[PDB]
Amino acid sequence: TPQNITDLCAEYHNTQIYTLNDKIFSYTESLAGKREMAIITFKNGAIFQVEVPGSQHIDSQKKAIERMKDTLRIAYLTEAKVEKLCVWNNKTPHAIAAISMAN
Amino acid sequence: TPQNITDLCAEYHNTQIYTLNDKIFSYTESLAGKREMAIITFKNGAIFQVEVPGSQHIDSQKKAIERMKDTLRIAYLTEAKVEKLCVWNNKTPHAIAAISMAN
Amino acid sequence: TPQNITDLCAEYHNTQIYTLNDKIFSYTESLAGKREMAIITFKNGAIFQVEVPGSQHIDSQKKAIERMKDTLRIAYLTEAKVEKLCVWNNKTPHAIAAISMAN
Amino acid sequence: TPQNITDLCAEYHNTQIYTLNDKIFSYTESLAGKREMAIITFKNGAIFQVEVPGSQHIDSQKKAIERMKDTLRIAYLTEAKVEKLCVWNNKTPHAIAAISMAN
Amino acid sequence: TPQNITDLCAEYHNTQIYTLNDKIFSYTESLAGKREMAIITFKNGAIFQVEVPGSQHIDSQKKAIERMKDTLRIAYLTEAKVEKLCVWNNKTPHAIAAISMAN
Ligand SMILES: CC(=O)N[C@@H]1[C@@H](O[C@@H]2O[C@@H](C)[C@@H](O)[C@@H](O)[C@@H]2O)[C@H](O[C@@H]2O[C@H](CO)[C@H](O)[C@H](O[C@H]3O[C@H](CO)[C@H](O)[C@H](O)[C@H]3NC(C)=O)[C@H]2O[C@@H]2O[C@@H](C)[C@@H](O)[C@@H](O)[C@@H]2O)[C@@H](CO)O[C@@H]1O
Ligand SMILES: C[C@@H]1O[C@@H](O)[C@@H](O)[C@H](O)[C@@H]1O
Ligand SMILES: [Ca+2]
Ligand SMILES: [Ca+2]
Ligand SMILES: [Ca+2]
Ligand SMILES: [Ca+2]
Ligand SMILES: [Ca+2]
Ligand SMILES: [Ca+2]
Ligand SMILES: [Ca+2]
Ligand SMILES: [Ca+2]
Ligand SMILES: [Ca+2]
Ligand SMILES: [Ca+2]
């Protein structure tokens, strides 16, 4: 089991760490069919998504996808500093796998 | 996959963008049968609904309808600035599809 | 579809609007068997319940009842001004059908 | 249907009302197997539990047990004054049945 | 039934109490397949996880795992002082079984 986001991210293929050390600039959420997703942006122009749930996700990830969207909404509203994000760079916008928060 | 709300909204028929750049003036919700819905207003007189779930919605959308109501309530209570709404304009009140917040 | 709480309330028999324009003075909740309910009061001595969920409530109302209790708790805790309540007046205490908040 | 916590509490055997009129001093929560519970304390030394779900609880109480633990956590973190608790006094620690908040 | 976290922790093998008396330094969460987990750290260097749900967890522990992650996230975001953690010391990082908060 990994002890931090960087080591967790290294267990997966096609992932990358982005270091933001910044609060979320914008939070977007959609209930429209086939686009049930969240998008966040940062000041520096980075855009990330939480993926629409789909056949590519195992059952155990479903509750974790809904948790991530909850986390990003409350992070946004509290102006919490996002340290790092682990993302899948094979999606556009890049797709969030993990988040760390520190300040 | 769209990268912002405007591009998302363009994926659907019968939608338009509003750019409020304002907090929600009023928040209403109902638990009455066949009217389990939220209504929000803005200082400028605009009125929007989150629709009663129904045939127009597929199964993946039910969780997102609930999340949208959660998002609107906490945005109201935090006085969070709404940047844009994507809404369906063949409903009265216009029906929310997506929201962006930025300040 | 109604555009406000007052028009929504009028669609039901045995309802009326209370206009409080005040924060919730007390919040009570119960997990006791057959009394899984909430009760709120206002400084003017008005008392209202969220009903125990039952057979008089269709499935779509079950989620909405739980949301409403969530709403009242967080409204209480943030001292949010309640504008109006739509309530069934054929229950004692009068039972909440809808709420609007504005300040 | 009762209109306050004291009358609700008096509908049950083996209960009494504690009047705290004080914030929660400590909040404890456990996920350990067979001890999935919460424990709160007050400055006066009083200690109360939300019980582990089990056969003494009817199906309608399961969501309300979860709601209560959510309520105690947010009350703790907001320093919300707890007015009264209705508790079962045949459990050790005494087990919460209902809570009222007012300040 | 135990009345405090120390006595609760003593009911289990492979556990120990850490007395932190400190807010959470970082919060990390992951939706990644098979690492649906949370990691917290403290200023003193200590690292703890909430375990990926698994065969070592009975079905009653599943809601509580979800709650604990909710609790850690809101604690981090309110800078809530964590008094004690009961952790399993046969996992790496040590895995949270219980938390107490007081300040
Ligand atoms: C609003 C807009 O147009 N924004 C773009 C940025 O793209 C957005 O954000 C990124 C993270 C992706 O989610 C995009 O889909 C999204 O539109 C854009 O960021 C770059 O996007 C690239 C992917 O299209 C790529 O991720 C790039 O970073 C990687 O590639 C560059 C090549 O120059 C470098 O090798 C980086 O080291 C590498 N990073 C890795 C592998 O972790 C993104 O660029 C980086 O992130 C930006 C936010 C910014 O900090 C850049 O300086 C940095 O290189 C940027 C590109 O400038 O333009 C718009 O802001
Ligand atoms: C009201 C009481 O408070 C503490 O003193 C506990 O030890 C008792 O069991 C009871 O829960
Ligand atoms: Ca600010
Ligand atoms: Ca801080
Ligand atoms: Ca204001
Ligand atoms: Ca702000
Ligand atoms: Ca006040
Ligand atoms: Ca206000
Ligand atoms: Ca204080
Ligand atoms: Ca107050
Ligand atoms: Ca601080
Ligand atoms: Ca405090």
Author numbering:
A (entry chain D), B (entry chain C), C (entry chain B), D (entry chain A), E (entry chain E): 1 to 103
Quote the authors verbatim.
In response to environmental stimuli, the bacterium produces and secretes its main virulence factor, the cholera toxin (CT). CT is an AB5 protein toxin, which consists of one toxic A-subunit (CTA) and five identical B-subunits arranged in a doughnut-shaped ring (CTB).
Crystal structures of the cCTB and ET CTB complexes with A-penta-BGA were determined to a resolution of 1.4 Å and 1.6 Å, respectively. The main differences between the cCTB and ET CTB structures concern the internal Gal residue, which interacts with Tyr18 and His94 in the ET CTB structure, while in cCTB, it is too far away from the shorter His18 side chain to form a hydrogen bond. It is noteworthy that in the ET CTB structure exclusively, Gln16 often has a different conformation and points away from the ligand-binding site, thereby weakening the H-bonding network to the ligand. Notably, the GalNAc residue is close to Tyr18 and not Ile47, the substitution of which restored binding activity. In addition, we observe a conformational change of Gln16 upon binding of A-penta (BGA or HMO), which suggests that this residue interferes with binding in its native conformation.
